[PDB]
Design a protein around this ligand. Structure first.
Ligand SMILES: C[C@]12CCc3c(ccc4cc(O)ccc34)[C@@H]1CCC2=O
Ligand SMILES: C[C@]12CCc3c(ccc4cc(O)ccc34)[C@@H]1CCC2=O
Lengths: 125, 125
């Protein structure tokens, strides 16, 4: 089935995969017809190909991501607070969002939504 | 309109109202036909009366609640990590969930969902 332990584990695999730039590891977490909403408001990408392409572009730069709090998992859902750090042109940026995963009975992620705004983007000059 | 600043402010008012046991202050944040999903999975209470009753029972005990991280506000949505502490029969409990608010154009909350599980309930013996 799908348990809080399993959802928490998936969140951790997700986080470790972004760190390793393990694209197959990330997509394998999703259902074939899942949706990924990179930033709320935007049009949710659908399907394995779309999902993989999104993460592929998100990995152009080396990312350092970690959970900053315990994962919240309950009845087919999980939400977590974390940070995604990267550096560009001598500038270090740290995006602090909160993600939400919706699982199916198979334990696969059918829906992922990343929530963050300008105030959650911490960068120097 | 509805802005990240306004949504963040509503989250802070929400948190301060629970602390003050200000029931009118909390309900006033919601749209008349809003829904509150106390714990994911359960049936979402609907309408002012239902919403107020839920918070009324949640305030039977004195609650100490605070944000533990920055609020995430983007396009009609906000999510936040926080703690709700209370004491009973000499036992101190701290529930650490992540909430999600959906706003309308008026800046009112039309949907609130609290996400947390047993692993997010920290209590001693
Ligand atoms: C796209 C991005 C890399 C990945 C990423 C960002 C923000 C939120 C995320 C949420 C995720 O669940 C997975 C990856 C990201 C960054 C915004 C700036 C940047 O370089
Ligand atoms: C009901 C409760 C008081 C309020 C409350 C809890 C958990 C999550 C919440 C999320 C909210 O957005 C507002 C109030 C609560 C506690 C669980 C144990 C308890 O006494």
């Amino acid at each position: 089935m799908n348990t809080p332990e399993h959802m928490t584990a998936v969140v951790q695999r997700y986080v470790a995969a972004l760190n390793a730039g393990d694209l197959d590891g990330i997509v394998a977490l999703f259902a074939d017809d899942a949706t990924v909403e990179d930033a709320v408001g935007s049009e949710p990408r659908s399907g394995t190909a779309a999902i993989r392409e999104f993460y592929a572009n998100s990995l152009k730069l080396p990312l350092a991501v970690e959970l900053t709090q315990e994962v919240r998992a309950v009845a087919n859902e999980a939400a977590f607070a974390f940070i995604v750090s990267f550096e560009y042109q001598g500038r270090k940026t740290v995006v602090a969002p909160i993600d939400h995963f919706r699982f199916n009975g198979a334990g696969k992620v059918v829906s992922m939504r990343a929530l963050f705004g300008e105030k959650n983007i911490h960068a120097g000059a």
